[PDB]
C-alpha cells in the first residue's frame, strides 16, 4: 500500500530533485535537470504539483521573449501531467547583489531591486494560478553585530511586505504570502528566525491578514525548538498557510533530508496534528536528495517522502481511534484540558474557596499524570506493535 | 571606577543570591538567606532594588498573621535602605501540584488554584510599589507529545492572562504583566519558548496593551538565537518592558552565570543597544551564584554583575562617539539602511527604470560591505584597544 | 509478545526507578523507595539485575553497624528474587564536600577522602558479584577558565585511576573499571566529556587493559554527536564494558528519558549494532520516570525501557535477514568497506596504474551509492511496513 | 602597537583570504586569487608563512609539464617574499568522485586513489620543507545508519595511515601528521568527530609517534565543547602538532569567522594555555573573510586575525604576571591541585586516618572556592580595566 495519489496534495519544489549536489566542500555530483522533465517524472510517482523560484524556471539575465519560452514549455507540461503550481517564491540570495538581503540590504539602490523582482514574478505566480507566495530571507541577517541595526532592518522588512501587499490589493489578486523563518545559515543570524518572530512581525503589518508563516521542519529543529509545538500556535492563530517538510538530525547546518528520516517521533506528532487539525493546504517537500545519490536515488527519495507521510498518517489515524488511547486520554485529563479555566467569570473564581482556601493542594499534587503509559501506546502504535 | 549607584537602576532577585546550591545532583552548599539581610547586603553594594516570588518572601503554607509578620519585617528594611521593588512574580514551578504546569495544567482546579495563586501576589505587588509583574510559565509544557495538546493549552494560556489582565483593570491598579520565556528545562519543551513567540501571543489577548516580555540572555541563548536581534524586535514592538540579565555557554542547561559571563561580545552589544535605544526600566539580574562558592563568593559575584554592565557600557558609548567608528557606519551605509526604501511609493517604484531596467546589478553586487573593518573598530573598542 | 525474561540481561539502577522527582526548579513528587520494594518490583517486570551507588544503598554517614544492616536486607532480597548486581558504582557528586569534583578537586584531603570512599565501596561490590565498577565524574570540571589547570587535573584523574587499579591488582580482584563521560550539566563544562576523550585517556593509565567506557546514549547526545558512531568505535578499539540506555531530545540538558523515546531511530542503529556486533554485557537503564507519573507511572516507565528494547531487536533483525536488504546492502558496496584497501602492500599500491594514471575519475564518480533506497528499506522495517 | 612580525610564526591557508564567497545558497562575490599575491599581500601584513591543498596550488587535472610551472612559480614567491609552507594537505573532499569519502569509501578503488593522490602530495610538501601533513576527512562519514558500517570504516582507516606512515618511514622523510577532526558539515555526522576520538584512535596506529591533532577552535564548538578544555588534553597527550584558529558562534554550520570572533573569551583562555604551555608550533588561521566583503575586507580580516591573537597575549600575560592574580590562584588552591594526591602511595592512605575516618567532611564542604573573584579578575585584565 502507501502510494500516493494527487488527491493527498503532495508537491515538491523545482529545486529539490533539481538541487545538483554542490555544498560548501564540494562540485556538484549531478546533472542539471530539465524543469519540464522534472514536473513529468514527478507526476509519474503521484505528485499533485511543483513549486519554484523565479530563477529555477527563467535563467537569471532572460531576455523578455526567452522568458516566454521557458513559460510557455513549462504550462505545457503542467498541461500535459495535470500537475499543479500552489506556491511561488522569488530567488533573492543566490546572486551576488544579494550579499547583504534584498528587503534589508543596507543599500537602498538594492532594496529597490529586490522588490521589482518580487513583483515580476507575483504576475507569473498568478497566471500559473499559485494560491501562496512564500518570501525565505535567506540573506537577511548579519554576521557581526554593528552591520545591521535591527529596528532599522524590521522598518525596511515592514516597508517592503506592505508594498507588496498594497500591489496585490491594488491588482485584485487572490494570493496570500507566507514568510518562511530559519534562524541561521547562510547569514550567522537571520531575521525572524523562529516561527514565532515571523508571527510577532505579521501582527505590524498594514494588512495582517494577507501573511501567514511557511514553516519548515528542520529550520525550527536548527533552533532545538518542537516543530509540533510551533505548528500548533500557528494553527491556533490562523496563520498556517503553506507548511515544509524535511528531516534535520539536531542542531547543526540544514540537512534538508527526505520526510521521515531525522526525528521520526516529531514526524509522527506532526502528521497527527495536520491531520486532527484539518491543514488542508499542500503537503510540499523542501529537501535535497544527498549528493551521494545518482538520478534514481533522487526518485526514490522523493518516492519516500509521500511514502513516509502515508505511513505515519495511517499510524496517527489507528492511534487516535484506538479506544483503550481514548482511555487514556481520558486518564490524564486531556478532556479537562480543553474545558475552560473560569467559564463562571471572575468573580466567581474570587469567590470560590474550592479554588484557593479549602482547595486540598496534597490531593492534587498527589494524582499522576499517567503520561508513560499514553506515550507507550503511542510508541507501540507508531512501530505498529498494536 | 565603575562603581555602582542606585540610579543605575541595578535590581536582583531574592532566589538570586538566595540560591543554595542545590541543582538535581546534589546538595545544598549555602545557609538560607533571611530576605532582610539580602536586602542589606544588596543596598550596600550599590543596587536600587529586589524582586521576589510570593514563595521567596512568605513561605508556602504561611497563616495570613505569619503573612502579615513577613511582609513588614521586610517593608521594615525597605525603608531603612531606600531600596526599591519594581517587579514581582508567582511561584507556579516547585510545589508538586504544579508539576504539569499552572495555568495550563491538565487538571482544571490546578488551573484555579494557579489563578488565585496569582492574584493574591499582585495585590501584594501593588501594595509594594512594583510596576511589573513577571510570568514565567517553567511547568507549561510537556515531555511526550501526546500529554499536551497545546491549541487547548494556549486556549487555557490565552483565558489565563484575560482573567488577570480583567482583574487589575477592575482594580485599577497601575501594573503590567510581563511574560519571560524559555525553551526548555524543567519541561522538556516549554510553551511559549523564545521572545517571538511571546509577542505573537501577546497579540490575541484581548488587552494586548496591558502585556509585555521580560527576555533573559541565557535562555534566548539556549536555543542558539542572537539575544541582542531578539531584544530589538522586542523593542520595536514596544514590549521591552522589564529584562533579565546573565550570561549563558550556548546550548545546555540553564547555567545563569553573572552577566558579563557567557558570551561576552553578545553581552556588549546588548549593552550597545538597550543604552542607545533609551530602556529606561530595571537592569535586573537573574542569575546564580556557582555553588562552588561560599557568601563572600555570592557577593563578589553579584558585585560583578554590575561592574561587567558598567564597563561595557563605558565601551559601548566610546565605540559609538569615536569619528572614526562614524566614518565606518557610513562606509558600511548604515545610514542608507534608515533610509526608506519607497517613501516615493508604489506607482513611483514601478516606473523607476533605475530600480530594475537599468539597474548596474554587476557594479552593486561588487561593492564591499566593510562590515570586517567595523567590526575589528568594535573589537578594538571592547578590548580597551582604542 | 516483547514479555522480557532475566535472559535479555535487562538491569536499572537503584536511583532510576527511585527518583523522587526532585529537579533544579521543583520539590520531590514521589515519596523515596525502599531498595528491597525496588528489587522485587523489577523482578517481577522481567529485569536482569540491579545496580547501585554506595550512598544508594547505605545512607551516607551510617555506622558499620547500621551499614551490615542494610547490606544484609539487600542480600536478602537478591537472594529471594534471583535478581544479579552486575555493576556497581560510587556517588562523588551530591555531598557538599565534592562541589568541586572528588578525584580532582583543588583540595588535596577532599581527592584523599575521595579515594577511600571509593575503595570502601569496591569491596563492597566484589562481595556482591559485580564485574564492572563505573565512575562517572559528575563533579570533575569547571565553570569558568581559570578555576581549574586541566593539565593538572588530568594528572590527578590518572593518578587516583592508577591507584584504583593497584588496588584492585593487589587484592586479586576480578572487577574492570567504566569510565562513564558526560559532557556537562552539573558543571559548566566537565573533564572527559565524550567516549572518545575518556578513550584516549584509557590509554594513558599504567594498567589500559583494567579500563574501558560506559556511555550513556543521552550524553553523547547534549554534545550533537552520533551515539551508535560512538559505540561501534568503542567496540572497535575493544572497550565497551558495559553501556547506559535512555533518551534525549537533542542539545540540552539531560533528560534520562526512557529508552526508545528520544531519537527513535538512533535506537534502532544502536540495537542493531550491539547485537550485530555480539555485546553480552547488560543492557542497563539509567532513565528517570518523568516527575509527572505516580508510582504506577514508574514501573510502566520501567517496563517500557525493555519493551522498546525488544521491539527494536526484532525490527533490527528482520532489517538484516531480508534478502532484498542484503541485495542493497551490496549494490551500495558495504561488502567492499569490509575489503583491505591495499592487502597487495604499499609498493603494489605505489606500482598500480590503475590506482592513480589510469584511474577513471569521472566513471567512479558518476556511480551512485544508493543510499536513499537502501536507508527506506530501513524505515519500512522499523515502522513494520515490512 | 600589535603589529605582528614573521617571529610571532602566523600562518594562513591559501583556501582562506583566497575563498571566493561561495556559499551552498550563493554565488561567488569574489574573483580568485593568483597564489604568488596571496603570498605577497601576506608577507606584506606580517605573516610567517602559508600552507596549502594540493589542489589549491596546482589545479586539479594539471599535467606534469603544468605542475612543475605552478610550483616553480610559488618557490619564486616563496623566495622572493621570506615566507615558509609549514604545513600541507590533501583535497580529499572537492572532486565528485570523493563524495562517499577518500580513506574510507564504500568503493575500494576509490581509497586507492586517495592514497595514490596523498602520497603525490607528501613528497611536494618535503620538497617545500613542511614538518607537519594535516589530513581532514571531512567525506569520512554518513547521513544515514546503514550506508557506514563504522567499524570496517576505522579498519580502513587505521590501513590507510599506517600506509601513510610505512610510505614516510621508508623514504626516511621528516614529517608528522596531523588528523583534524570535525564532528559533521558537510556529512551528516563525520568519523572522529572531535579530538577525543581522533586522539584515542592514533593511539591504535602502528606507529602512534608519528601521529597527532590539528584541532580547530570552530569544530569543536560545533559539538558545544570547550575548545581550551580539548587543547589541554592533546597538550598533556604530547599530540599537539599544528592547531586552526578562528571563530565560531556557537552550534551551527562552520562559520569559520576572523580568530578573536565568536567565543572571545574561549579565545581569551585558548592563548593563555598556549603560551604559558610554550606551544611553539605555527598559529595557523583557518578562516573564512564573509562573503560580504570586497578585496580590501579580505586583507582587513586577515589582519584582524592576528592583531587580536597579540591584544590576547597580552592580557593573558597581564593577567597571570599579577601580584593578585597569583594570590587569587592560590585562595582558590590551583597550587594544591597541581600537587600529588598521594605521593605515599596506596598503603600509606589506606593507613590514614586522616583521610576518611577522622576527615571533617561538614568543614571541608564549608570552605568557598573563590572561584568567582578569580573570574572577575580574569574579565579585567580582558577588558583592560585592570
Ligand atoms: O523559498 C523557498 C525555498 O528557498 C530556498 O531554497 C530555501 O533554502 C528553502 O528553505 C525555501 O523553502
Ligand atoms: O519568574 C522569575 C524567575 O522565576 C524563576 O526563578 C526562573 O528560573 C527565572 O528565570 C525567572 O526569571
Ligand atoms: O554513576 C552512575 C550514574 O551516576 C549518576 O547518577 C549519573 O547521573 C548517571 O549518569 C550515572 O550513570
Ligand atoms: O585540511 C585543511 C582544511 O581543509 C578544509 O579546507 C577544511 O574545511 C578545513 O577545516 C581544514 O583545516
Ligand atoms: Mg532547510
Ligand atoms: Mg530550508
Ligand atoms: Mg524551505
Ligand atoms: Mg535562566
Ligand atoms: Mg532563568
Ligand atoms: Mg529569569
Ligand atoms: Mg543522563
Ligand atoms: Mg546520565
Ligand atoms: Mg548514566
Ligand atoms: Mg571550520
Ligand atoms: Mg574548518
Ligand atoms: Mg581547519
Same mark, same amino acid.
Given at each position: 500500500?502507501?502510494?500516493?495519489?494527487?488527491?493527498?496534495?503532495?508537491?515538491?519544489?523545482?529545486?529539490?530533485?533539481?538541487?545538483?549536489?554542490? #555544498?560548501?566542500?564540494?562540485?556538484?555530483?549531478?546533472?542539471?535537470?530539465?524543469?519540464?522533465?522534472?514536473?513529468?517524472?514527478?507526476?509519474?510517482? $503521484?505528485?499533485? %504539483?511543483?513549486?519554484?523560484?523565479?530563477?529555477?524556471?527563467?535563467?537569471?539575465?532572460?531576455? #523578455?521573449?526567452?522568458?516566454?519560452?521557458? +513559460?510557455?514549455?513549462?504550462?505545457?507540461?503542467? #498541461?500535459?501531467?495535470?500537475?499543479?503550481?500552489?506556491?511561488?517564491?522569488?530567488?533573492?540570495?543566490?546572486?551576488?547583489?544579494?550579499?547583504?538581503?534584498?528587503?534589508?540590504?543596507?543599500?537602498?539602490?538594492?532594496?529597490?531591486?529586490?522588490?521589482?523582482?518580487?513583483?515580476?514574478?507575483?504576475?507569473?505566480? +498568478?497566471?500559473?494560478? !499559485?494560491?501562496?507566495?512564500?518570501?525565505?530571507?535567506?540573506?537577511?541577517?548579519?554576521?557581526?553585530? $554593528?552591520?545591521?541595526?535591527?529596528?532599522?532592518?524590521?522598518?525596511?522588512?515592514?516597508?517592503?511586505?506592505?508594498?507588496?501587499?498594497?500591489?496585490?490589493?491594488?491588482?485584485?489578486?487572490? &494570493?496570500?504570502?507566507?514568510?518562511?523563518?530559519?534562524?541561521?545559515?547562510?547569514?550567522?543570524?537571520?531575521?525572524?528566525?523562529?516561527?514565532?518572530?515571523?508571527?510577532?512581525?505579521?501582527?505590524?503589518?498594514?494588512?495582517?491578514?494577507?501573511?501567514?508563516?511557511?514553516?519548515?521542519? %528542520?529550520?525550527?529543529?536548527?533552533?532545538?525548538?518542537?516543530?509540533?509545538? %510551533?505548528?500548533?500556535?500557528?494553527?491556533?492563530?490562523?496563520?498556517?498557510?503553506?507548511?515544509?517538510?524535511?528531516?534535520?538530525?539536531?542542531?547543526?547546518?540544514?540537512?534538508?533530508?527526505?520526510?521521515?528520516? %531525522?526525528?521520526?517521533?516529531?514526524?509522527?506528532?506532526?502528521?497527527?496534528?495536520?491531520?486532527?487539525?484539518?491543514?488542508?493546504?499542500?503537503?510540499?517537500?523542501?529537501?535535497?536528495?544527498?549528493?551521494?545519490?545518482?538520478?534514481?536515488?533522487?526518485?526514490?527519495?522523493?518516492? $519516500?517522502?509521500?511514502?513516509?507521510?502515508? &505511513?505515519?498518517?495511517?499510524?496517527?489515524?489507528?492511534?487516535?481511534?484506538?479506544?483503550?488511547?481514548?482511555?487514556?486520554?481520558? !486518564?490524564?485529563?486531556?478532556?479537562?484540558?480543553?474545558?475552560?479555566?473560569?467559564?463562571?467569570?471572575?468573580?466567581?473564581?474570587?469567590?470560590?474557596?474550592?479554588?484557593?482556601?479549602?482547595?486540598?493542594?496534597? !490531593?492534587?499534587?498527589?494524582?499522576?499524570?499517567?503520561?508513560?503509559?499514553? #506515550?507507550?501506546?503511542?510508541?507501540?502504535?507508531?512501530?505498529?506493535?498494536?
Amino acid at each position: 500500500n502507501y502510494q500516493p495519489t494527487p488527491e493527498d496534495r503532495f508537491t515538491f519544489g523545482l529545486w529539490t530533485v533539481g538541487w545538483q549536489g554542490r #555544498d560548501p566542500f564540494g562540485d556538484a555530483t549531478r546533472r542539471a535537470l530539465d524543469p519540464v522533465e522534472s514536473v513529468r517524472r514527478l507526476a509519474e510517482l $503521484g505528485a499533485h %504539483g511543483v513549486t519554484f523560484h523565479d530563477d529555477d524556471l527563467i535563467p537569471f539575465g532572460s531576455s #523578455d521573449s526567452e522568458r516566454e519560452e521557458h +513559460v510557455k514549455r513549462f504550462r505545457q507540461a503542467l #498541461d500535459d501531467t495535470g500537475m499543479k503550481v500552489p506556491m511561488a517564491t522569488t530567488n533573492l540570495f543566490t546572486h551576488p547583489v544579494f550579499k547583504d538581503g534584498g528587503f534589508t540590504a543596507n543599500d537602498r539602490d538594492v532594496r529597490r531591486y529586490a522588490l521589482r523582482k518580487t513583483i515580476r514574478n507575483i504576475d507569473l505566480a +498568478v497566471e500559473l494560478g !499559485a494560491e501562496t507566495y512564500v518570501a525565505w530571507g535567506g540573506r537577511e541577517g548579519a554576521e557581526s553585530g $554593528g552591520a545591521k541595526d535591527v529596528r532599522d532592518a524590521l522598518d525596511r522588512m515592514k516597508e517592503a511586505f506592505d508594498l507588496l501587499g498594497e500591489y496585490v490589493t491594488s491588482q485584485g489578486y487572490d &494570493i496570500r504570502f507566507a514568510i518562511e523563518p530559519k534562524p541561521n545559515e547562510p547569514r550567522g543570524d537571520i531575521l525572524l528566525p523562529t516561527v514565532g518572530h515571523a508571527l510577532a512581525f505579521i501582527e505590524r503589518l498594514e494588512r495582517p491578514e494577507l501573511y501567514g508563516v511557511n514553516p519548515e521542519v %528542520g529550520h525550527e529543529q536548527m533552533a532545538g525548538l518542537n516543530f509540533p509545538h %510551533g505548528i500548533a500556535q500557528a494553527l491556533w492563530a490562523g496563520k498556517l498557510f503553506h507548511i515544509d517538510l524535511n528531516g534535520q538530525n539536531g542542531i547543526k547546518y540544514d540537512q534538508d533530508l527526505r520526510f521521515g528520516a %531525522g526525528d521520526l517521533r516529531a514526524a509522527f506528532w506532526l502528521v497527527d496534528l495536520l491531520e486532527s487539525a484539518g491543514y488542508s493546504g499542500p503537503r510540499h517537500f523542501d529537501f535535497k536528495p544527498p549528493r551521494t545519490e545518482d538520478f534514481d536515488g533522487v526518485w526514490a527519495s522523493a518516492a $519516500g517522502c509521500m511514502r513516509n507521510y502515508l &505511513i505515519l498518517k495511517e499510524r496517527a489515524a489507528a492511534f487516535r481511534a484506538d479506544p483503550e488511547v481514548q482511555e487514556a486520554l481520558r !486518564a490524564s485529563r486531556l478532556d479537562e484540558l480543553a474545558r475552560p479555566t473560569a467559564a463562571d467569570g471572575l468573580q466567581a473564581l474570587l469567590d470560590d474557596r474550592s479554588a484557593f482556601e479549602e482547595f486540598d493542594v496534597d !490531593a492534587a499534587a498527589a494524582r499522576g499524570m499517567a503520561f508513560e503509559r499514553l #506515550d507507550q501506546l503511542a510508541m507501540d502504535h507508531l512501530l505498529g506493535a498494536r
